[PDB]
Amino acid sequence: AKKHYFIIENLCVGCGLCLDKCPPKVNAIGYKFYGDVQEGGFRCYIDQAACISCSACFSGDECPSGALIEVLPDGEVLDFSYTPPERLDFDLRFL
Amino acid sequence: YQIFDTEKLDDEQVVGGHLALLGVLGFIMGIYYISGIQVFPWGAPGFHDNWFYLTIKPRMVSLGIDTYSTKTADLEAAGARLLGWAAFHFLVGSVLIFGGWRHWTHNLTNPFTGRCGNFRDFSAKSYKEALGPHAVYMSLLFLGWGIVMWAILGFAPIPDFQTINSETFMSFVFAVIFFALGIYWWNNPPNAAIHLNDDMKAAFSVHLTAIGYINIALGCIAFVAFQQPSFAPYYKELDKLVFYLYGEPFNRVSFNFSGAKEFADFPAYAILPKSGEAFGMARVVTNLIVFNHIICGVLYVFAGVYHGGQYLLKIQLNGMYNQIKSIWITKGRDQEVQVKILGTVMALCFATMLSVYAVIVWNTICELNIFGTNITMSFYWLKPLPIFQWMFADPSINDWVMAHVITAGSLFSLIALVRIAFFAHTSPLWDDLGLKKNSYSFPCLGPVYGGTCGVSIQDQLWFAMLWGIKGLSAVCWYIDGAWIASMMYGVPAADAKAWDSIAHLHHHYTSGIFYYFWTETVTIFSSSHLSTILMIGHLVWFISFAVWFEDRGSRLEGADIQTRTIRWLGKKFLNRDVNFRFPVLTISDSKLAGTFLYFGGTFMLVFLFLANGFYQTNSPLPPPV
Amino acid sequence: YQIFDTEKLDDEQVVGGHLALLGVLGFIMGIYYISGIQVFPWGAPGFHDNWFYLTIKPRMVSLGIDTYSTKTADLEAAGARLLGWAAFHFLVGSVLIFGGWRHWTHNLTNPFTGRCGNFRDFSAKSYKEALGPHAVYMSLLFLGWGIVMWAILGFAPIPDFQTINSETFMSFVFAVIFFALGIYWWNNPPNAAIHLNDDMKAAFSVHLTAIGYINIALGCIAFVAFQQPSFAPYYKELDKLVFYLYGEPFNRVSFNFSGAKEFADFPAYAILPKSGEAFGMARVVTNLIVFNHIICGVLYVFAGVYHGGQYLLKIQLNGMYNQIKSIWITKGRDQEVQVKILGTVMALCFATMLSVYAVIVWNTICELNIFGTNITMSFYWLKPLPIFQWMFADPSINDWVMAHVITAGSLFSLIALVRIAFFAHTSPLWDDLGLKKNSYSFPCLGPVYGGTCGVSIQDQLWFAMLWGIKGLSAVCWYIDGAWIASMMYGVPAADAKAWDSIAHLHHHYTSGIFYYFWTETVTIFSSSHLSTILMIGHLVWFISFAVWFEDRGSRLEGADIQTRTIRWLGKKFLNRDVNFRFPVLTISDSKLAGTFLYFGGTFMLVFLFLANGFYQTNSPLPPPV
Ligand code: G2O
Ligand code: G2O
Ligand SMILES: [Ca+2]
Ligand SMILES: [Ca+2]
């Protein structure tokens, strides 16, 4: 359906937590090695011809690198299902 | 194992579960009471001594329930009193469990009158308004205990701090202050405001960690108190008694059963009488009581910090972590104090244990005369300062190393606890890269950057427990008189039997750290019961390696291969009898299961060090010249 | 640690390195020879006994070089002969190292004549054409040894298989057959064709694994041979000698140095004489020799299989794995024989150790009379079959468990070896999903599917070594007479003091499996040297846990935090003296380093079991009635 999910290549670390939640009838998530898997050479990816937009991949809040995005149906791009409100800070000392 | 997690329960179910648990406690205490019966008032030669009742016998003898004698009237009266108290405990426990039923299911209705009851008013809305009336509630418990002693057990309240009448006097003094403190908090609640919102995880974690230090305090208080002349009638009257335990070396029987057995004792397979004054029973019971509260106290501390992290992580995921005024949060929400605070604790931990470990090996080197050295070259002169020599009896070098091993052991575990407290969501390295922690239980992130194992806060809890073994075990050696000052002692090799005289020890310790194992197990091997505990403890412990090594994927290999053998073997030997497909624990379960086998296995064996005798002499061990 | 990897060397550098290593071996053998000197021919009271020379002394005494006597002429002649042989070894080793230089740098040129030399012809192109002339080369080594004995050491070749003259006779008999076998292979090379293409990894791995079984064979042959009446003049003439070792309990000295020390012995700090017949020295040396070849033999086997996997993986990555007609490949290139073969070996391993472990606990239960049982209820009657009772002296139950523990131990390690052999690139589960193995050393793949730790073939090698400890350690107990039949024995608890009586053992073993540790260490604690080895071995071993647990990411945390403390501490205590940034081992290095600390630490301690005495009596230990 709408709102595809689109794992980012350059940020992925290959932890594989994204791959767990995808239903076994849908093997939409896979691996790519192209090198030695100790300096980050087994990044995963999503197959768009099998994905059925479960949101199990995004709504689970598991990606630690922000590699899952879940682009919105019209044009919008997400990175995590909710973000804190970005305040700004200092130091205090009660005299 | 998360069926009773805090975010799923409301407030009443906590009260119901607590009442039910109190009832269960009453049942088991009554069970202990009738486990300590000797004669059965109708006359039915009862039970033999077991470690559960021998732990509480001094308290009963102090309260005038049990006694230290073997006569007609004494045992008959003691059994009757114990039966009465056990029945009373059973009755109150049944009532309490019924009340637990009543509070668990939201059903506060009177059985006699068709009345109801609202948990809101009957009062308090938040937990700070509840702190107040609780102090009034506890003032009643102190008041009742003073009444129970005075009315039933005698012991009129008298301020004499050498006999138990002072305890009755104190319970009335405390009821004054807890009541007076109760009213003021009912009118002026105090304020650490964050504990009321997620009040069943945040406030719980603070209480659990606070209870942990309290248990350690009573652990140390009991050790000092029980060795006073005032406590003499109840603790080292144990020495001049004779004990019959279960698992004692029994009256052996030959194959002629004829059969010249044993000493002249009419029962065959009789339990031999064991003297309780060659056996250091007065100290053995004291060690058992003290160590139980110390290890339980430490464990509550680790749990209290761990659950604080579970809450602490949660408020950083939704967004409120930025949103606290409580100073208990702003003092560490900076990421430059955290490095300084963690830096200054990991360096002090470095400076301390390196100092003691240098002393311990140097003393060990000096005995064996390795590299051509004498014992005169050892630190046999490093006594504590004279202003600190009151807290020790016979101050010496053995006390100096102990006072620092505890510091070195404690701060070694504090590193993990701090890293739970601060780096629950982000660490300087994890924010150095672009990375998260999101589950407080994720095992790793993969082989990227060389490996990312055990970074979550649950793993940090495991290492605090594992590092805490060294600190906890150091207590077992010290309270059993083990001369932790050098790692060999009493060994007939070069100079170990010299410590005595060059240091004027005026006592005689059992052995060194290594030689601790060869000695002591003279008595462990003499008992068949203690021998089985030795074998079981070692079997459980090493199984931890099956789940603690980096092998979970390897075990996932064989499970697949196994499934096909029990699959191909029900094929042409027996007919179709097989559908079972082997499960392997996940990494998170592997560490949880591994830590319990490691921690459980080692401390079932520590029991043998304590519950096998004291065996500390007072002979200065003249020189081996 | 891959500086000398095989894919980087050509053929000559192997020959050069081998020649250099042979020269080094000659140097160290000469060093041993002069380490075994007693008197120094000019007269200079020499060295005391050490374990390196005492291992080879029987061989020298058999060859008429050393002797068992303390006189004037005997020691003077023995020292001279040893010096001569050491000098000869030094000379030949220097020549061999120079030849290693000559072959390592592609410089086969004569120094006298301006000649050159081609490694191709001077011959052979492939390794099967080289097998032939080597057998001719070895026929010369056998021929020379017969010449060296006959011409120099006497011992004319005589076929009497009770004295050493048979050895001289055999070396001439062997030179006949190796020469005759050499010509035929020079004309008819044999054919396992795949070993010639990648010939410095494939052929090497087969040889290394083949040498491993050879070493185990000579390990067992020596144990049987050295206990024959023919070998009596060289091995249990050791018993009626007196030995002076380094690290012996020395002449102690008081603080008066005056100083009434010791026995009447003129040297102060003198080494006490130790009788070699109360001390079971005749068997101690035999145990030391045998165990060295057994453990080295096993290790070569694991390495040979591991390097075969490195080759086996490589030919599956380029594509030639599909491309072999060697039957040694087609018998397992199917993925349905592999499951059947691995299935039938993991089930036999299941059926065997469960049988012995059931017997061992049942015997252990029966002694301690747990659950109301007698020793008559134990398996004190399960002797080996009468057709198998020739291979044992005094057949009993202790032999039955040993013969099966070896099988159970061996097949337990074979599981890892098979999984190296077959699942180097793909496994049924890894092909069940879509996945690879590509590096033979990758540590894991991440927490996906619950965890993927230790699936590579290097990790499988580690588990074979770790599982092989149980099989290897069972040999140490058995050859030292440890009664592995029950886990407690000689223990004065219930019935462990009997055993011999009800079984008619006709010997007396030291102890049980657990009680093995309490005994034996009576002598270990008596020696300061053995005591230090005990402490060092245990220190090295437990450090394996620092790198074997799932904690590499946790250690990567502190290294970052540490770097900032030594960074913030050179800031305001001392001035700018700090740029160092702490490295943590990767998971692959962590397992490599962990396995060495685990394997190295445990076997430095096994040396203490062997090199502390035999202590096996011959008293049937009358009943404890
Ligand atoms: C006594 C301790 C152990 C076993 C018993 C055993 C059994 C076992 N292990 Mg193990 N193991 C370690 C200890 C033990 N591993 C350690 C300390 C490490 C860390 C180094 C370790 C590591 C690995 C890796 C990495 C792998 C395995 C496997 C694998 C399986 C192989 C199948 C097999 O050989 O069949 C044969 C299996 C048997 C004959 C088992 C029968 C026993 C009888 C019932 C004895 C009773 C056991 C016990 C006393 C009762 C339990 C009571 C307790 C709960 C109070 C097989 C079940 C492998 C698989 O899982 O699949 C192949 C694998 O990959 N391991
Ligand atoms: C005696 C054995 C051990 C230490 C000594 C030690 C030292 C240490 N460990 Mg450890 N460790 C284990 C054993 C030892 N871990 C085990 C068995 C496990 C598995 C459960 C284990 C696991 C973790 C995890 C998971 C983490 C650490 C760390 C961490 C660092 C913390 C920094 C600190 O406390 O400063 C204080 C550090 C010291 C005072 C070290 C000074 C000692 C003096 C020189 C004694 C000499 C040591 C030795 C005798 C000489 C070596 C000779 C040998 C090669 C023949 C710190 C260097 C952590 C870090 O790496 O960074 C924070 C971390 O995350 N561990
Ligand atoms: Ca003790
Ligand atoms: Ca021995």
Side-chain angles (χ1 to χ4, degrees):
Chain A
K2 299 291 180 68
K3 51 168 52 189
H4 315 132
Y5 291 86
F6 284 133
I7 286 179
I8 292 177
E9 294 293 328
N10 297 115
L11 284 181
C12 180
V13 293
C15 68
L17 314 168
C18 55
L19 187 153
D20 291 331
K21 273 137 190 159
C22 186
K25 300 289 94 175
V26 184
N27 290 318
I29 305 189
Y31 267 108
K32 291 177 70 68
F33 297 87
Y34 66 78
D36 186 74
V37 298
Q38 184 178 182
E39 312 86 333
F42 60 115
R43 68 181 65 252
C44 66
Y45 74 100
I46 281 185
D47 175 53
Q48 297 297 334
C51 177
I52 59 152
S53 308
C54 307
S55 179
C57 44
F58 194 80
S59 54
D61 291 331
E62 69 275 16
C63 191
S65 67
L68 282 72
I69 52 182
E70 190 276 331
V71 298
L72 277 296
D74 55 355
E76 309 188 74
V77 160
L78 275 183
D79 182 276
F80 186 77
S81 296
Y82 170 73
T83 318
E86 55 288 355
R87 320 173 73 252
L88 66 89
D89 289 345
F90 55 71
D91 182 75
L92 62 80
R93 266 160 215 186
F94 288 111
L95 73 165
Chain B
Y1 59 95
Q2 312 177 354
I3 186 167
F4 293 139
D5 179 342
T6 186
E7 293 177 350
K8 317 198 315 297
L9 313 182
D10 63 15
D11 200 287
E12 246 196 8
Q13 305 199 281
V14 173
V15 181
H18 275 140
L19 289 179
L21 287 173
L22 288 167
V24 175
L25 190 56
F27 285 139
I28 63 170
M29 292 293 297
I31 285 188
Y32 290 168
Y33 294 163
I34 294 169
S35 71
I37 298 282
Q38 295 276 326
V39 292
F40 284 45
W42 37 50
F47 308 145
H48 293 137
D49 308 334
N50 57 346
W51 285 118
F52 286 94
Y53 186 67
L54 294 174
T55 303
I56 60 174
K57 189 156 191 173
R59 181 50 162 170
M60 294 291 178
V61 171
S62 63
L63 296 184
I65 303 184
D66 204 353
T67 185
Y68 292 143
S69 293
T70 187
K71 293 179 179 179
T72 59
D74 60 357
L75 289 165
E76 293 300 43
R81 291 198 287 277
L82 275 167
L83 294 159
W85 281 105
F88 186 89
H89 270 56
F90 288 142
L91 183 63
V92 184
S94 176
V95 168
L96 277 182
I97 283 179
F98 161 72
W101 183 258
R102 286 316 174 181
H103 278 71
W104 182 277
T105 58
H106 295 88
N107 195 2
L108 306 181
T109 56
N110 188 277
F112 321 106
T113 65
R115 200 172 67 244
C116 293
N118 202 335
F119 201 78
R120 292 183 184 174
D121 53 2
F122 49 92
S123 73
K125 179 62 173 171
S126 81
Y127 291 62
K128 64 182 181 293
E129 293 84 355
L131 157 60
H134 294 186
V136 190
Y137 196 76
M138 284 173 214
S139 66
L140 286 189
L141 288 187
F142 280 100
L143 185 61
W145 178 237
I147 290 299
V148 173
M149 305 191 66
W150 197 356
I152 302 182
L153 305 169
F155 304 144
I158 295 153
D160 186 8
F161 297 84
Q162 300 304 298
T163 188
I164 206 177
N165 293 356
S166 59
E167 184 187 78
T168 304
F169 182 77
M170 294 300 293
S171 62
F172 284 103
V173 168
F174 280 116
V176 170
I177 64 169
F178 293 100
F179 185 81
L181 199 41
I183 294 169
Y184 170 83
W185 277 330
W186 207 325
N187 300 342
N188 297 115
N191 192 31
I194 51 167
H195 290 312
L196 295 174
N197 303 40
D198 190 20
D199 181 65
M200 195 190 290
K201 172 68 76 181
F204 161 66
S205 68
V206 172
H207 290 54
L208 188 48
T209 189
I211 287 298
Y213 285 38
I214 299 308
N215 221 348
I216 299 179
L218 295 174
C220 305
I221 290 172
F223 172 74
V224 175
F226 292 164
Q227 299 168 346
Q228 304 297 299
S230 64
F231 282 68
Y234 323 107
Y235 274 92
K236 293 179 179 179
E237 287 294 329
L238 289 167
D239 284 336
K240 293 179 179 179
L241 297 175
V242 174
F243 306 92
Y244 292 85
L245 271 67
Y246 292 113
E248 294 236 341
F250 62 92
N251 196 292
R252 254 178 300 189
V253 158
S254 76
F255 303 131
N256 303 335
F257 275 79
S258 61
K261 304 177 293 294
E262 242 284 330
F263 299 127
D265 275 334
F266 189 37
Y269 292 148
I271 282 182
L272 277 296
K274 182 174 73 175
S275 66
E277 63 185 342
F279 190 95
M281 191 53 113
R283 182 77 168 258
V284 161
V285 180
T286 307
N287 294 358
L288 281 173
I289 296 169
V290 169
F291 204 92
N292 169 35
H293 299 70
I294 298 298
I295 188 178
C296 289
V298 174
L299 284 185
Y300 301 159
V301 177
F302 293 162
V305 174
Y306 161 70
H307 292 98
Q310 283 178 328
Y311 171 82
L312 233 67
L313 182 63
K314 182 174 71 68
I315 52 169
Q316 304 184 34
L317 283 184
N318 289 337
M320 294 300 293
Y321 185 59
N322 298 11
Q323 303 200 22
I324 297 307
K325 268 26 139 187
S326 293
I327 63 170
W328 289 86
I329 300 299
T330 59
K331 299 296 289 184
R333 176 170 70 203
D334 202 284
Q335 199 86 339
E336 290 77 13
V337 175
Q338 300 178 355
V339 177
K340 281 156 186 156
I341 281 179
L342 188 57
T344 187
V345 66
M346 183 176 282
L348 280 180
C349 170
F350 180 71
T352 314
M353 80 176 74
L354 177 63
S355 299
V356 296
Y357 200 77
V359 174
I360 289 189
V361 297
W362 188 245
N363 290 328
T364 306
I365 285 171
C366 284
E367 297 165 347
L368 311 178
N369 300 116
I370 314 300
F371 315 126
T373 61
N374 288 321
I375 205 172
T376 62
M377 305 177 51
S378 60
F379 295 101
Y380 74 107
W381 47 268
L382 188 48
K383 277 188 301 306
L385 298 183
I387 73 185
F388 286 105
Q389 292 191 15
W390 52 269
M391 60 186 56
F392 298 136
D394 179 53
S396 66
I397 185 65
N398 187 34
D399 308 299
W400 188 91
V401 295
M402 186 54 192
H404 305 55
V405 161
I406 293 297
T407 59
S410 305
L411 295 174
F412 186 48
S413 64
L414 182 61
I415 300 156
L417 298 182
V418 173
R419 292 186 349 177
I420 296 183
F422 293 158
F423 307 154
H425 189 30
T426 61
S427 175
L429 181 64
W430 293 97
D431 185 42
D432 184 1
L433 295 174
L435 285 165
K436 293 179 179 179
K437 306 146 180 180
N438 297 327
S439 87
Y440 72 72
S441 68
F442 68 103
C444 73
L445 281 186
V448 66
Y449 302 110
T452 54
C453 296
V455 296
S456 64
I457 77 167
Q458 189 169 103
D459 308 305
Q460 297 303 302
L461 166 71
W462 302 142
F463 302 137
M465 293 177 70
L466 289 189
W467 296 345
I469 291 190
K470 306 298 295 182
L472 285 171
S473 44
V475 179
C476 172
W477 269 248
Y478 189 59
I479 69 185
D480 214 22
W483 183 262
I484 69 174
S486 70
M487 292 177 72
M488 307 271 238
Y489 175 85
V491 173
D495 272 357
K497 293 179 179 179
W499 277 113
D500 295 283
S501 71
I502 201 166
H504 307 324
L505 293 175
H506 182 254
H507 295 285
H508 182 249
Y509 306 84
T510 71
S511 52
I513 294 167
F514 277 79
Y515 198 62
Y516 197 72
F517 292 90
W518 189 83
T519 59
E520 285 209 270
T521 59
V522 175
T523 59
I524 292 178
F525 287 134
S526 59
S527 178
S528 52
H529 177 228
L530 297 180
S531 293
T532 63
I533 303 174
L534 191 69
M535 294 182 286
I536 294 169
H538 286 98
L539 162 65
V540 171
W541 181 73
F542 83 88
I543 295 172
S544 299
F545 305 156
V547 289
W548 261 116
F549 287 8
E550 284 92 352
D551 59 353
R552 195 266 174 191
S554 177
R555 322 203 311 264
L556 183 59
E557 306 237 354
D560 194 34
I561 301 309
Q562 286 171 10
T563 306
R564 305 187 180 205
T565 313
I566 294 169
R567 200 157 101 201
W568 159 63
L569 291 191
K571 183 178 179 180
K572 66 181 181 67
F573 297 172
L574 73 164
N575 285 25
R576 291 182 180 176
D577 293 350
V578 288
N579 281 318
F580 175 55
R581 293 182 183 174
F582 289 85
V584 297
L585 297 174
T586 70
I587 299 186
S588 285
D589 289 345
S590 298
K591 297 183 196 177
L592 177 63
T595 317
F596 276 55
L597 304 164
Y598 198 112
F599 205 88
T602 177
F603 279 109
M604 293 180 358
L605 300 161
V606 177
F607 172 78
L608 305 182
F609 282 158
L610 299 171
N612 79 327
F614 191 34
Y615 315 131
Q616 184 178 2
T617 318
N618 284 314
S619 61
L621 191 70
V625 306
Chain C
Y1 59 95
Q2 312 177 354
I3 186 167
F4 293 139
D5 179 342
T6 186
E7 293 177 350
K8 317 198 315 297
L9 313 182
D10 63 15
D11 200 287
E12 246 196 8
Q13 305 199 281
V14 173
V15 181
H18 275 140
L19 289 179
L21 287 173
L22 288 167
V24 175
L25 190 56
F27 285 139
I28 63 170
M29 292 293 297
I31 285 188
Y32 290 168
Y33 294 163
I34 61 171
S35 71
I37 298 282
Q38 295 276 326
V39 292
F40 276 142
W42 47 92
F47 307 145
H48 293 137
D49 308 334
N50 57 346
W51 285 118
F52 286 94
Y53 186 67
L54 294 174
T55 303
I56 60 174
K57 189 156 191 173
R59 181 50 162 170
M60 294 291 178
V61 171
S62 63
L63 296 184
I65 303 184
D66 204 353
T67 185
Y68 292 143
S69 293
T70 187
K71 293 179 179 179
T72 59
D74 60 357
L75 289 165
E76 293 300 43
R81 291 197 287 277
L82 275 167
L83 294 159
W85 281 105
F88 186 89
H89 270 56
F90 288 142
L91 183 63
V92 184
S94 176
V95 168
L96 277 182
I97 283 179
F98 161 72
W101 183 258
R102 297 292 182 194
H103 278 71
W104 182 277
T105 58
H106 295 88
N107 195 2
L108 306 181
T109 56
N110 188 277
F112 321 106
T113 65
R115 200 172 67 244
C116 293
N118 202 335
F119 201 78
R120 295 188 183 257
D121 53 2
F122 49 92
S123 73
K125 293 179 179 179
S126 81
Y127 291 62
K128 64 182 181 293
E129 293 84 355
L131 157 60
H134 294 186
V136 190
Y137 196 76
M138 284 173 214
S139 67
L140 286 189
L141 288 187
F142 280 100
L143 185 61
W145 178 237
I147 290 299
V148 173
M149 305 191 66
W150 197 356
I152 302 182
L153 305 169
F155 304 144
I158 295 153
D160 185 8
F161 297 84
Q162 300 304 298
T163 188
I164 206 177
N165 293 357
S166 59
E167 184 187 78
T168 304
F169 182 77
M170 294 300 293
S171 62
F172 284 103
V173 168
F174 280 116
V176 170
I177 64 169
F178 293 100
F179 185 81
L181 199 41
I183 294 169
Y184 170 83
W185 276 330
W186 207 325
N187 300 342
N188 297 115
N191 289 337
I194 51 167
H195 290 312
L196 275 66
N197 303 40
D198 190 20
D199 61 356
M200 195 190 290
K201 172 68 76 181
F204 161 66
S205 68
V206 172
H207 290 54
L208 188 48
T209 299
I211 287 298
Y213 285 38
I214 299 308
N215 221 348
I216 299 179
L218 295 174
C220 305
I221 290 172
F223 172 74
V224 175
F226 292 164
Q227 299 168 346
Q228 304 297 299
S230 64
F231 282 68
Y234 323 107
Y235 274 92
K236 293 179 179 179
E237 287 294 329
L238 289 167
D239 284 336
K240 293 179 179 179
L241 297 175
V242 174
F243 306 92
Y244 292 85
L245 271 67
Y246 292 113
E248 294 236 341
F250 62 92
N251 196 292
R252 254 178 300 189
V253 158
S254 75
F255 303 131
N256 303 335
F257 275 79
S258 61
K261 304 178 293 295
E262 242 284 330
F263 298 127
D265 275 334
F266 189 37
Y269 292 148
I271 282 182
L272 277 296
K274 182 174 73 175
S275 66
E277 63 185 342
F279 190 95
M281 191 53 113
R283 182 77 168 258
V284 161
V285 179
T286 307
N287 294 358
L288 281 173
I289 296 169
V290 169
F291 204 92
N292 169 35
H293 299 70
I294 298 298
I295 188 178
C296 289
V298 174
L299 284 185
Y300 301 160
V301 177
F302 293 162
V305 174
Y306 161 70
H307 292 98
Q310 283 178 328
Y311 171 82
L312 233 67
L313 182 63
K314 182 174 71 68
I315 52 169
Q316 304 184 34
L317 283 184
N318 56 8
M320 264 206 267
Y321 185 59
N322 298 11
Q323 303 200 22
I324 297 308
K325 292 11 103 175
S326 293
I327 63 170
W328 289 86
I329 300 299
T330 59
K331 299 296 289 184
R333 186 165 74 228
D334 201 284
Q335 199 86 339
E336 290 77 13
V337 175
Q338 300 178 355
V339 177
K340 281 156 186 156
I341 281 179
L342 188 57
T344 187
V345 66
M346 183 176 282
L348 280 180
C349 170
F350 181 71
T352 314
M353 80 176 74
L354 177 63
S355 299
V356 296
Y357 199 77
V359 174
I360 289 189
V361 297
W362 188 245
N363 290 328
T364 306
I365 285 171
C366 284
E367 297 165 347
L368 311 178
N369 300 116
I370 314 300
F371 315 126
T373 61
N374 288 321
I375 205 173
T376 62
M377 305 177 51
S378 60
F379 295 101
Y380 74 107
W381 47 268
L382 188 48
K383 277 188 301 306
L385 298 183
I387 73 185
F388 286 105
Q389 292 191 15
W390 52 269
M391 60 186 56
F392 298 136
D394 180 53
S396 66
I397 185 65
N398 187 34
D399 308 299
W400 188 91
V401 295
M402 186 54 192
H404 305 55
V405 161
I406 293 297
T407 59
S410 305
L411 295 174
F412 186 48
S413 64
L414 182 61
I415 300 156
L417 298 182
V418 173
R419 292 186 349 177
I420 296 183
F422 293 158
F423 307 154
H425 189 30
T426 61
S427 175
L429 181 64
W430 293 97
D431 185 42
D432 184 1
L433 295 174
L435 285 165
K436 298 292 180 65
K437 306 146 180 180
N438 296 327
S439 87
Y440 72 72
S441 68
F442 68 103
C444 73
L445 281 186
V448 66
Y449 302 110
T452 54
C453 296
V455 296
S456 64
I457 77 166
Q458 189 169 103
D459 308 305
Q460 297 303 302
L461 166 71
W462 303 142
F463 302 137
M465 293 177 70
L466 289 189
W467 296 345
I469 291 190
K470 306 298 295 182
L472 285 171
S473 44
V475 179
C476 172
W477 269 248
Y478 189 59
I479 69 185
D480 214 22
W483 183 262
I484 69 174
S486 70
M487 292 177 72
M488 307 271 238
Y489 175 85
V491 173
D495 272 357
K497 267 297 200 301
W499 264 123
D500 181 65
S501 64
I502 201 166
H504 307 324
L505 293 175
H506 182 254
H507 295 285
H508 181 249
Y509 306 84
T510 71
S511 52
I513 294 167
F514 277 79
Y515 198 62
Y516 197 72
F517 292 90
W518 189 83
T519 59
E520 285 209 90
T521 59
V522 175
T523 59
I524 292 178
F525 287 134
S526 59
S527 178
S528 52
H529 177 228
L530 297 180
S531 293
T532 63
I533 303 174
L534 191 70
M535 294 182 286
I536 294 169
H538 286 98
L539 162 65
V540 171
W541 181 73
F542 83 88
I543 295 173
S544 299
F545 305 156
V547 289
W548 261 116
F549 287 9
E550 284 92 352
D551 59 353
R552 196 266 174 191
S554 177
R555 322 203 311 264
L556 183 58
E557 306 237 354
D560 194 34
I561 301 309
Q562 286 171 10
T563 306
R564 305 187 180 205
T565 313
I566 61 171
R567 215 160 95 210
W568 159 63
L569 291 191
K571 183 178 179 180
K572 66 181 181 67
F573 297 172
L574 73 165
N575 285 25
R576 293 182 183 174
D577 293 350
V578 288
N579 281 318
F580 175 55
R581 293 182 183 174
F582 289 85
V584 297
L585 297 174
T586 70
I587 299 186
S588 285
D589 289 345
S590 298
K591 297 183 196 177
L592 177 63
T595 317
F596 276 55
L597 303 164
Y598 198 112
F599 205 88
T602 177
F603 279 108
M604 293 180 358
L605 300 161
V606 177
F607 172 78
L608 305 182
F609 282 158
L610 299 171
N612 79 327
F614 191 34
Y615 315 131
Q616 184 178 2
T617 318
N618 284 314
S619 61
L621 191 70
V625 307

